[PDB]
Amino acid sequence: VKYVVPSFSAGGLVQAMVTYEGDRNESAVFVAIRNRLHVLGPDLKSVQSLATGPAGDPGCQTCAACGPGPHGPPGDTDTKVLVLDPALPALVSCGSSLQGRCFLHDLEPQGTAVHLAAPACLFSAHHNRPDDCPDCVASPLGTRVTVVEQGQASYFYVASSLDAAVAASFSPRSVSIRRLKADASGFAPGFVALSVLPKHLVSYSIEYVHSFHTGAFVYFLTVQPASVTDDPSALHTRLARLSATEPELGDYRELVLDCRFAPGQPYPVLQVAHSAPVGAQLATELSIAEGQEVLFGVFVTGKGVGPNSVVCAFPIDLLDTLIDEGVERCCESPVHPGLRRGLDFFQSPSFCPNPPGLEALSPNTSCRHFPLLVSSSFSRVDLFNGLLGPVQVTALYVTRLDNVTVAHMGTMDGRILQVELVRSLNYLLYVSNFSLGDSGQPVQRDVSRLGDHLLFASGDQVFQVPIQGPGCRHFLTCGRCLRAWHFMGCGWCGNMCGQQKECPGSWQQDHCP
Numbered sequence: 001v002k003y004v005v006p007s008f009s010a011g012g013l014v015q016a017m018v019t020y021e022g023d024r025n026e027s028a029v030f031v032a033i034r035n036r037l038h039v040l041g042p043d044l045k046s047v048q049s050l051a052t053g054p055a056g057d058p059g060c061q062t063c064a065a066c067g068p069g070p071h072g073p074p075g076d077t078d079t080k081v082l083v084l085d086p087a088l089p090a091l092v093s094c095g096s097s098l099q100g101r102c103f104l105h106d107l108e109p110q111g112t113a114v115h116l117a118a119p120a121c122l123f124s125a126h127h128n129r130p131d132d133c134p135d136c137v138a139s140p141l142g143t144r145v146t147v148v149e150q151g152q153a154s155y156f157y158v159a160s161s162l163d164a165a166v167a168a169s170f171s172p173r174s175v176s177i178r179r180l181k182a183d184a185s186g187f188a189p190g191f192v193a194l195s196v197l198p199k200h201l202v203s204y205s206i207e208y209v210h211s212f213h214t215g216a217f218v219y220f221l222t223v224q225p226a227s228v229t230d231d232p233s234a235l236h237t238r239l240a241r242l243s244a245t246e247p248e249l250g251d252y253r254e255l256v257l258d259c260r261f262a263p264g265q266p267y268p269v270l271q272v273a274h275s276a277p278v279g280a281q282l283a284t285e286l287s288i289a290e291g292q293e294v295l296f297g298v299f300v301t302g303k304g305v306g307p308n309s310v311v312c313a314f315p316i317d318l319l320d321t322l323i324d325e326g327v328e329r330c331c332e333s334p335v336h337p338g339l340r341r342g343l344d345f346f347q348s349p350s351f352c353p354n355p356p357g358l359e360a361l362s363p364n365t366s367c368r369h370f371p372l373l374v375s376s377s378f379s380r381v382d383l384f385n386g387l388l389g390p391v392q393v394t395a396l397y398v399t400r401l402d403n404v405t406v407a408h409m410g411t412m413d414g415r416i417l418q419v420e421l422v423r424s425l426n427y428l429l430y431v432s433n434f435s436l437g438d439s440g441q442p443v444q445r446d447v448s449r450l451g452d453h454l455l456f457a458s459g460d461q462v463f464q465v466p467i468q469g470p471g472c473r474h475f476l477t478c479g480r481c482l483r484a485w486h487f488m489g490c491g492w493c494g495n496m497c498g499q500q501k502e503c504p505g506s507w508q509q510d511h512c513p
């Protein structure tokens, strides 16, 4: 386990981290702690900082941008969302405080780094009501945001966990699609939204693990109760799919995802997820085409035999097909009976093809025009055949590198494992292990890329790790050098391990003296 020194100490537990790489070779890391946002340059040294709380503090620089104070309740600001809007380009931050409002921070050139212009408060006074708040975006219970450009407008696809206390007034809703106004004063009213019905808010809640935009859709991954009339600890994982091309939630779709250890045993609870295009080797094994986008998920049982963690692969094109087939099953032809529409937490029960709460489909109305849950689940089996054993995976980032696909897995004890993503039987193919300093705190869920390094947080620090694993020069004998994976371009120079270019006449990968 190669020791990795921290690159940045945040002064507090890192709540959120996202990166930016611009067109002009400018880049940045945005790192959020309670009450503070940090901007780092490409060398991961700080260029700027901003006070994001506490609310009703004169020193709160985001709060101050909402105009003459104060704004309440007073309280600490925990950062729930950090997202880039590349169209501007601008960072958007949204906090636990101040009704979940967001702030807009224009990116300005600063050498190879970036600096943020003074914050715009995305909350207009005369525009938000306790019963209707287009600018109430984030929930202290947690929020995922994906930004999609449609023509010359930026839309914010927002999922926010709810309960009764958060929804009472100025509620953020469950799923929404909000247009950011060009004058930076807020989001456009009239946005569309689904949320957990007040009657269900009492006992039913939804966690949002991940969100991403690929092809014509925005996808959210969720953990929630298997059923609305069921123990709120019988949890499972769902994929929610929304149109990325129209700002509408009529055809919102969910699909239950089922990963199992099957040498089988279900691992119903999603811990962390990442999607990425796969290399040719894994593509062949999954029967898809090289470079196809695959959604990878780390699952746990959520509570004897079996690994602590499994990793399942769900190719995006197959998920979309399963969903399309689910729609036809609900809405086509003669529908088979007893097929539920579902999403009872968002809408009234009904059976396909009827609209929520109804027993007939009227001729002026379309079955597909209402949200539905796909009737059968998508089941996959652990790519790693239980080989992660007792390891508790807390973070995941997948990178394609020619034919090879690598998983970079963060652990509960502060390690990174890099493993080739293949269907494994008897052993895992480790590229490299890292330790992140030696607090051994958990690796935080959210992993960012910067150039050819990945950034991971644990505790109050950010670390960088090479995507390709350690340089060839770290292999000190010929056998070791030649044991290195293909993709690294390591070859023995005679007394030295290097790339071809360091010993053009002797570089070889073939055998040892």
Ligand SMILES: *[C@@H]1O[C@H](CO)[C@@H](O[C@@H]2O[C@H](CO)[C@@H](O[C@@H]3O[C@H](CO)[C@@H](O)[C@H](O[C@@H]4O[C@H](CO)[C@@H](O)[C@H](O)[C@@H]4O)[C@@H]3O)[C@H](O)[C@H]2NC(C)=O)[C@H](O)[C@H]1NC(C)=O
Pocket: 001, 387, 388, 389, 390, 391, 417, 428, 430, 431, 432, 433
């Ligand atoms: C990166 O990180 C991984 C830590 O999770 C680590 O993986 C573990 O490595 C250890 C040491 O090799 C593995 O322990 C072996 O497991 C199998 C069990 O069948 C055995 O081959 C093996 O042989 C022996 O076990 C004997 C007991 O019968 C023991 O006395 C000997 O000492 C001998 O080791 C070990 O039991 C462990 O299973 C691996 N775990 C997992 C979850 O994969 C990697 O080594 C490390 N990789 C790199 C490239 O750095």
